[PDB]
Every structure is written in C-alpha cells, then in structure tokens.
Amino acid sequence: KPYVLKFQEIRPGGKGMNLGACSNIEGVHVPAEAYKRTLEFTQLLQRLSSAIREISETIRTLIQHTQIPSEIASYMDATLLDVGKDALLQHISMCWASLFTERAIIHRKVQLAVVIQQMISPSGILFTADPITSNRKSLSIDDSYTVRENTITNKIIDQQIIQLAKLGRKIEAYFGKPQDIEWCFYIVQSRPITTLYPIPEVNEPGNRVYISVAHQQMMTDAMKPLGLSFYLMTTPATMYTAGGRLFVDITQSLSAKVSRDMMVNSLGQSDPLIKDALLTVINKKGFLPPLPTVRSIPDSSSVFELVRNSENSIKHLKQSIETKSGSDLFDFIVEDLEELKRVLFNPTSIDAIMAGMDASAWLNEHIYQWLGEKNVADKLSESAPNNITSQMGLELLDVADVIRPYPAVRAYLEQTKNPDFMNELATLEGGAETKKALEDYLQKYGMRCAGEIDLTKTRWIENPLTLIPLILSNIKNFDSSASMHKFAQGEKEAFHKEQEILRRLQELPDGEQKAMETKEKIDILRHFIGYREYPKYGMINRYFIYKLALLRAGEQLVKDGILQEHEDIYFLYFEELREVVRTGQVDYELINARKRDFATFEKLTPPRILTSDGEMINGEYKRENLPKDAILGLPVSSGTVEGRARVILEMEKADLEDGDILVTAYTDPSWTPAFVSIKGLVTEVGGLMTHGAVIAREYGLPAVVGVENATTIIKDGQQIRINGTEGYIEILD
Ligand SMILES: CCOc1c(C)c(O)c2c(O)c3c(CNN4CCN(C)CC4)cc2c1[C@H](O)O/C=C/[C@H](OC)[C@@H](C)[C@@H](O[C@@H](C)O)[C@@H](C)[C@H](O)[C@@H](C)[C@@H](OP(=O)(O)O)[C@H](C)/C=C/C[C@H](C)C(=O)N3
Ligand SMILES: [Cl-]
C-alpha cells in the first residue's frame, strides 16, 4: 500500500476522492493508511471485541501519544515541500483519536485516512436542485437565491451569482447526478444529493405530469420491485414507478382540452387537491405544451353472481397453480393475469361499482339543493349489506367474543411473541375453540394485509400475531355481540334517514316525484355500494396465490445454490425473475442495489403530483368561511366529534380506547378492524370514494381525509375536534 499519494495520482478515505474525480477542474478552482503502523496498542482493541468506555481513555490518549516514526515523515515533507510538522502531529494524531469516541457513540477494525489541504478566503453553498420542491431545473444557493436558468425567481435578503449558477451544472454532468459542492469560486469538497424523490424513467418527448397512485390507493408505503411489477402488469393505465411507488402519466390527456377539462374536473371530485395542483402545473408557463386554438345499471342478481363468478375463478386458479413449477409457473401466471384482468375489469362489474358511486353523487347533489342537507348519502350508506371489507372489521369482534370467556387463553395472547402461537393453543382451555375462530377468520381475510397491493408484504395468515392487539382491544372495549348491535343500529339510522328525506321531499313543489326518484336511488345505493370493495378483494386473493407459488420457486433457487435468501425475489421484477429461473444466472450487484434503493425509498414520501423535473406538488385547500387555525381536509363522512387524537402509523401498535380519534397516514382495507372503537378518522391521503373513506360511512364514523402532515401537525394525546361534513380539524388542547 502506498504510504502517501496526492490527489491526482490516486486512481479508482471517502474524501480522498471528492478530490478524485474533481482534479479535472474545467472552468473552476482546484486546490492541492499511514496509521497501519499504529499497531501495547493491540491488546486494548481485542478488549473492545468484548460499559467500560474508559478504554477510549488510553486508546485515544496514546493517539496523542502516537509517535510518528520518521520512517517516512520526510516523505511527508518530501511532498508538501512544493506547496508544519508540529501541526501534522496535532491532527494526524488528532484524526486518529477520531477513531476512538465516535465509533463508540455509533463496526469493523478497518481504517479511515487523513486529508491535507490549504485555507483561503474571500460564502454560502450551491444546490443543483432546489430543496423546497425538488425541481431539477431550478436551483438555489445560500441570504439565498433562486434561479431557473439565467433568470431568478425570487430575491430575498447580483450578476456574479448567475455566472456561478453555471459552474455547478457543469460538474453536475461529470457525475450525472444533481450534486452538493460548497464554494467559498474555490471548492474544497463534493457529494451527490441523496434526498431527492426519483423521476419516473420515461423518455417519451418533453415535460410530463404524473398522478400519485399511493393517494388514490390509500397506501403511501414504498413497494418492493416484484410487488410493483404485479400492479404494473395488472393496470390498463399508463403507469410507471419512482421511489418505490407508482405513478400514472396523464400528460397526453392534458394536451387536448376537452380531454383536459374531463380529466381535471373528474379528478377534482375524488379530491380537490388534485385539481388545484393540476391547475397550478397548467399555469406554469413554458412547462406544459400549448393547447392549440348515463351508464347501465345491472340486475339485482348481478352482484351475487359477480362474487360467485370470482370465487370459482380463484378456486380454479388455486388448483391449476399447484402443479406448476419453474418456467411453467411463470408461463401460467402470465396467462392468468388475463383472467385477473377479466374478472377485475368486467364491464358488468364496473357498472355495478359505478351504480353505487353514481347514486351517492346523485343523492348528495339533489337532496342538498332540495332540503339543504349536505352529504345525505353518507348516513344512507350506513350498514350497507354485502361489503366484504366492512364485514371483516366487525367479524373480528365475533372472534373476540369467543376468546373473552377463556382466562387461560387471554393470559397467553397478552404476552406471547411467538409467530407460531396458533399451535400452542391446544394446551390451554379454550384454545381449541380460539384456534378455530382464528382459522375461520383467516380463511376469509388472511390474504389481506396493510400494503396488500404489494405482493411482497407479509399477509395476516403468514403472521397472525399482528391481529392479536386488535383482538385484545375488542375484548377490553366491548361486551359480547357488539357486531350485531353496531350493524343493526346502523340499519335503523339509515332507514330513519330514508323515511325522513322522503317525507320532507313531499312537502316541496312536485313532491311525490322527487321522493320516488330518490327512493330508487337509495335502493340502488344500498344494493351496490358494498360491492365496491370486492374487486380489490378478488385481486388480492390472486396475488397471495401468486406469492405462495413464487416463494416455492425462490426456495428452489436456494436449493440450486442460485439464491442465498429465498425472499430475494422481492427485489427482482417479474421480467427479471423469469430469466433467473430460466437461465440460472442472476446479478447480485443489482439485487443489493435494489435493497439499497428500497431503504432510501422508505424515507421518501410520495407527492400528490410529480413532474418530469422532479418537482413535487401537493394541492392547497380553499378556506371559504371555515374557522382559522382549522386544519383543512376532504370531508368523506358526515358528523362532528370531539375526542382524543391517536397518531398511530402501524396498526399492530394501535392501543385504541373508546373516544379516540384515529390520525394516520393511510387506511387501506386492512385498517378497518381499528374503526370499531374509534369515533373519528383522519388520514393524510385518500379520496372521496377510495378505501377507508367508503368504510367510514357504513360504520357511521366521521372522517376527514387528504390532511397534509396530519401525523406531524396533530400530536398523540391531543384533544381535537374534526368535522366530517365541512372537512376541517380543530385543536382544543
Ligand atoms: C388520474 C388517476 O389515474 C389512475 C390511478 C392513480 C390509479 O391508481 C388507477 C388504478 O389503480 C386502476 C385503474 C384501472 N381503471 N381502468 C381504466 C380503463 N379500463 C378500461 C377500465 C378501468 C386506473 C387508474 C387511473 C385512472 O386511469 O385514472 C382515474 C382513476 C380514478 O380514481 C380516482 C377512477 C377511474 C377510479 O374510480 C373512481 C371512479 O372512483 C378507478 C381507478 C377505479 O374505478 C377504482 C374504483 C379502483 O378501485 P380500487 O383501486 O380498488 O380502490 C379500481 C376498481 C381498481 C382496480 C385495480 C386495478 C389493479 C387497477 O389497476 N386499477
Ligand atoms: Cl414469546
């Protein structure tokens, strides 16, 4: 190993090369393992393998006590001569001592080296992409300046700064990445920006606009490559991936204008923040290219038969995939996705979904202009029949009803952390009865989980232990038969609402025509609004059957010595994994990079809108006569309540008592069992007719969605008041 080497001489410490590539310096200013012999010293270090932080005490006092054998210093001064020794000592030793306390604070017995350079004077910093919105084209320097390209947007407390903007964008190309170099124009150090949200690799002409799938799907978690792949292979929409999450391209729809006005207005009725964000993008001149100058309603028997038809499709798939392996397995999944798409996007099925959605809109619009009641379809939707997601939440109460009379079982569940607790219940009295209740519940809802759209996430039936805290809370928060009481009560309120509306309408001009037409919509509403949650349920069912088969293939790849861990298939796309099974070869520098990317994706939060310039845009609400200091959101379930806020990001750790108001990032279908005890819901994402929101209505639960940074603005334990009619939130304490 070379004792010493100057910056250009080095070829491919970390800083040792910030210098490395940079020696080139085109158009700008360029400046300018010796502790190997550090080896008394050695005895101490093997004591660290074994608190006693006194150690740093001598390991680090000898550092100052590290005597530099001249064995080479002249070399040291046989190099810096062209450009003292007491100084090298203070820090050379200084740097070594560095190894002593930090490492302890936060490991390998390998080493860091020292870099020597000179001090000069004239300063702020250069950002290649702005930090505020992550726009790759706009840049900002720190006293701070914001320039796009030779134009500055804002001036906040001046011709040479612009000369500068042009220096960063030069060296940016030398690494390709947007970078962070600080100039005081003489730059000492360099490094890339690692906080930016990735732009969807799409090299179709010009500026593009993307819609966040996470917001519509009520799930903001980063998804693994394989899971991302299966969603992309299912959707008919022009969808792409970025930052471990999914986005839909709508740029072409924005080029024409009747296409635009049908896209902007429609998305605005799922959540107003999309529209406000879109209109802002449109108002950005120079970005978006210049514009140039009744559904059918199925029979009553359709829903029953749509469910039956789907169930048997799953049943057939389950039998066919058992005999498949290797390349045959992948060949089968490719042609089964067509069957998935058929059941999921069946014209009759879509008509059944929209039948409930259209009826909700019809009521909410007409009843308001007639009687003055806003969002009456919420209360009319309470305890709607045949909602596979609503049933899931309430039936967990039934599970708790079985366990409650058994003290021996309860003592176990309260303390157990065994994933295989299902097979330890027969020992206890009532465990056999408890096992049955759990197995039956998991036979209906086991294929679901938080993040179910990601095929690679742990399902309930794979880790039943996550359902335990919800079960325990049900035992503590409720008496027996709470499922029947809650549902029956919902039916009463919904019917009393129906009779009230029809009665009041007959007092208006042309009474018994507004009522009869309303009665028709209410029937349609309560007959179809439940089916809304089912196509998702049928899709997830296929996903879990896929997962089990892919795991078998992953385990075969382990047996064949090709894969190390069988869950490493999660970081390969379907297209790639199919080749691994076929050829028998796999690039693990890729797999490790995928894992490395996923770890940074989790630290990212998807914007409502993402552009080609990496700009992250979330819409703004309009405060029309709403209270000031009120946190605005989208009202999706009528009612006003005061309760204790509970900021909970993971359902497994939710210790919900009666009176609590759930504040969280998202509520996908799997969150439903936590709706039974709370008296209000607040989410950061979601829309009018998305997951969670549709369930809150049927549960008679006041909910406000689309509340930005609700898990940060609202503190856990705070008393808050939410209004699910107007869509605002107040802090009281
Ligand atoms: C401009 C927004 O663009 C999107 C986005 C963001 C999407 O996430 C879209 C999307 O996930 C899908 C799909 C599949 N939609 N296809 C489109 C063309 N097909 C012939 C039939 C249906 C599109 C997504 C898009 C969409 O192009 O843009 C508008 C989406 C709207 O969402 C607010 C709207 C169409 C939405 O429903 C509205 C009306 O309430 C769509 C997505 C569905 O009907 C939902 C009801 C959705 O339900 P959910 O996801 O279970 O809550 C449907 C049933 C989902 C089926 C799952 C399937 C795997 C699929 O890929 N669907
Ligand atoms: Cl344990």
Ligand nearest to the CA of 412: 2
d(CA 289, CA 256) in angstroms, rounded, equals 10
Residues 239 and 226: their CA atoms lie apart, in Å, by: 15
CA distances to 380, 500, 508, 527, 668 from 376, rounded to whole Å, are 6, 11, 17, 16, 24
Measured from the Cα of 215, ligand 1's closest atom is 6
Q: Are 215 and 686 contacting, i.e. CB atoms less than 8 angstroms apart? A: yes
Which CATH number fits the domain that encloses residue 700?
A: 3.50.30.10
Q: Which domain holds residue 653?
A: 631-731
Q: Ligand 1, residue 690: give the atom nearest the CA.
A: 52
Protein residues with C-beta less than 5 angstroms from the ion ligand 2: 417-418
Choice from 210, 215, 216, 281 to test ligand 1 binding pocket (greatest atom count within 8 A of CB) = 216
CA–CA separation, 716 and 733 (whole Å) = 11
457 close to 353: Cβ distance less than 8 angstroms: no
Q: How far is CA 471 from CA 388, 397, 504, 678, in A?
A: 19, 7, 43, 15
The answer to whether 708 and 685 are in contact (CB under 8 A) is no
Output 417-424 pairs: Cβ under 8 A, ≥24 positions apart. Answer: 417/465, 418/465, 419/463, 419/464, 419/465, 421/464, 421/465, 421/468, 422/464
Query: Resolution, rounded to a tenth of an Å?
Result: 2.8
Ligand 1, atom nearest to 353 Cα? 46
| Cα–Cα–Cα angle for 459, 463, 464, rounded to 5 degrees | 105
Minimum CA distance residue for ligand 1 atom 26? 237
* φ and ψ of 138, to 5 deg: -75, 145
Write the DSSP assignment of 378-410 as a string of letters.
HHHTTT-SS-HHHHHHHHHHHHHHHHTT-HHHH
Alpha carbon 268 to its chain centroid, in Å, reads 22
Question: What is the Cα–Cα distance from 21 to 435, expressed in whole angstroms?
Answer: 63
The 8 Å CB, 24+ separation contacts for 298-303 are 298/348, 298/351, 298/352, 298/355, 300/527, 302/348, 302/352, 303/352, 303/386, 303/527, 303/528, 303/530, 303/531
Burial of 558 (0-12, 13-18, 19+ CB in 10 A): middle
The C-alpha angle 727, 691, 725, rounded to 5 degrees, equals 20
Helices (H), 404-460: 407-413, 431-445
What are 446's two structure tokens? 């086991």
Method: X-ray
Give the separation between CA 664 and CA 645, rounded to whole angstroms. Answer: 10
Cα–Cα distances in angstroms (integers) from residue 632 to residues 376, 635, 722, 724, in the given order: 21, 9, 10, 11
Which pair of structure tokens corresponds to residue 454?
């990601």
From its phi and psi, is residue 10 left (phi > 0), alpha (psi between -120 and 50) or beta? beta
Let me know: does 644 contact 718? Beta carbons within 8 Å: yes
Let me know how long the chain is.
Answer: 733
Q: How far is the CA of 489 from the centre of ligand 2 (A)?
A: 40
Give me ligand 2 centre to Cα 468, in Å: 13
Query: Going by C-beta distance under 8 Å and a sequence separation of 6 or more, which residues neighbour residue 533?
Result: 387, 388, 389, 390, 669, 691, 694, 695
Query: What are the DSSP calls for 188-231, one per residue?
Result: EEEEE---SPPPP---SSS--EEEEHHHHTT--S---HHHHHHH
Rounded to the nearest angstrom, the gap between the alpha carbon of residue 497 and the centroid of all alpha carbons in its chain is: 38
**Largest pairwise CA distance in the chain:** 106
Give distance in angstroms: CA of 345 to centre of ligand 1: 10
DSSP annotation of 23 = T
Q: Looking up tokens 């064995």, which residue turns up?
A: 71
Long-range contacts of 478-485 (CB under 8 A, 24+ apart): 478/397, 478/400, 478/676, 478/677, 480/401, 480/404, 481/401, 482/397, 482/401, 482/676, 483/394, 483/395, 483/397, 483/398, 483/401
Residue that has been written with the tokens 């079960």 in this structure: 471
| Pairing relationship of beta strands 660-664 and 209-212 according to DSSP bridges | unpaired
Nearest CA to ligand 1 atom 4: 248
Closest Cα partner for 22 from 126, 123, 172, 142? 172
Q: Is residue 377 within 8 Å of 364, Cβ to Cβ?
A: yes
Mutate which of 235, 254, 533 for ligand 1? The one with the most ligand atoms within 8 Å of its CB, which is 235
- 347's tokens: 């014209």
Strands 719-723 and 640-647: antiparallel
List the Cα angle 588/590/592 in 5-degree steps.
70
Whole-number Å distance, alpha carbon 663 to ligand 1 midpoint, is 26
d(CA 78, CA 64): 23
Please give the structure tokens belonging to residue 315.
């049943």
Q: What is the DSSP letter of 324?
A: -
- How far apart are alpha carbons 358 and 336 in whole angstroms? 31
Estimate the crossing angle of helix 300-320 against helix 347-370, to 10 degrees: 140
* Of the candidates 684, 678, 671, the residue with the CA atom closest to the CA atom of residue 711: 684
Please say if 691 is a catalytic residue: yes
CA 275 to chain centre: 22
* Closest ligand to the CA of 417: 2
Instruction: Calculate how far, in angstroms, residue 235's C-alpha sits from the geometric centre of ligand 1.
Output: 8
β strands within 11-128, DSSP E: 126-127
Do the Cβ atoms of 610 and 199 come closer than 8 Å? yes
CA distance 701 to 379: 10
From CA 502, how far away is CA 504, in angstroms rounded?
6
What are the angstrom distances between the C-alpha of 266 and each of 271, 328, 439, 521, 724? 9, 42, 42, 21, 22
Cα(441) to centroid of ligand 2, in Å? 23
First to last CA, the chain: 64
Q: How far is CA 696 from the centre of its chain?
A: 21
Residue 703: φ, ψ to 5°: -135, 140
Residue 464 CA to ligand 2 centre (angstroms): 14
In what helix (H) or strand (E) does residue 594 lie, and over which residues does it extend?
helix 588-601
CATH number of the structural domain spanning residue 43: 3.30.1490.20
Q: Exposed e or buried b for every residue in 164-200, given b needs 16+ CB within 10 A?
A: bbebbeebbeeeeebbbbbbeeebbebeeeeebbbbb
Residues of the chain by 3-state class (helix, strand, coil), percent to 5? 50, 10, 40
Q: In angstroms, rounded to a whole number, what is the distance separating the alpha carbons of residues 244 and 595?
A: 11
Atom of ligand 1 nearest to the CA of 536: 51
Kindly report the backbone phi and psi dihedral angles of residue 631, in degrees, each rounded to the nearest multiple of 5, phi listed first: -85, 110
| Ligand 1 atom with least separation from CA of 532 | 46
Q: In the structure, which protein residues have their CB atom closer than 6 angstroms to any atom of ligand 1?
A: 211, 213, 216-217, 234-237, 248, 250, 267, 270, 344-345, 353, 535-536, 539, 687, 689-691
Provide the residue type at 580 as one letter. Answer: V
Q: Check 107, 215, 316, 691 and give the catalytic one.
A: 691
* Beta strands 209-212; 609-611: pairing state: antiparallel
Q: Which of 515, 389, 372 is nearest to 444 (CA)?
A: 389
Task: Indicate which residue's Cα is closest to atom 18 of ligand 1.
Answer: 236
Q: Which of 212, 592, 656, 576 is nearest to 393 (CA)?
A: 656
How is residue 141 written in tokens? 């320097």
d(CA 547, CA 570): 10
Instruction: Say which residues have a Cβ less than 8 Å from residue 452's Cβ, sequence separation at least 6.
Output: 459, 540, 543, 668, 669, 670
Ligand with the closest atom to the CA of 465: 2
**Which ligand 1 atom is the nearest neighbour of the CA of 354?**
39
At residue 452, the 3 state secondary structure works out as coil
The sign of the CA dihedral 369, 373, 374, 379 is negative
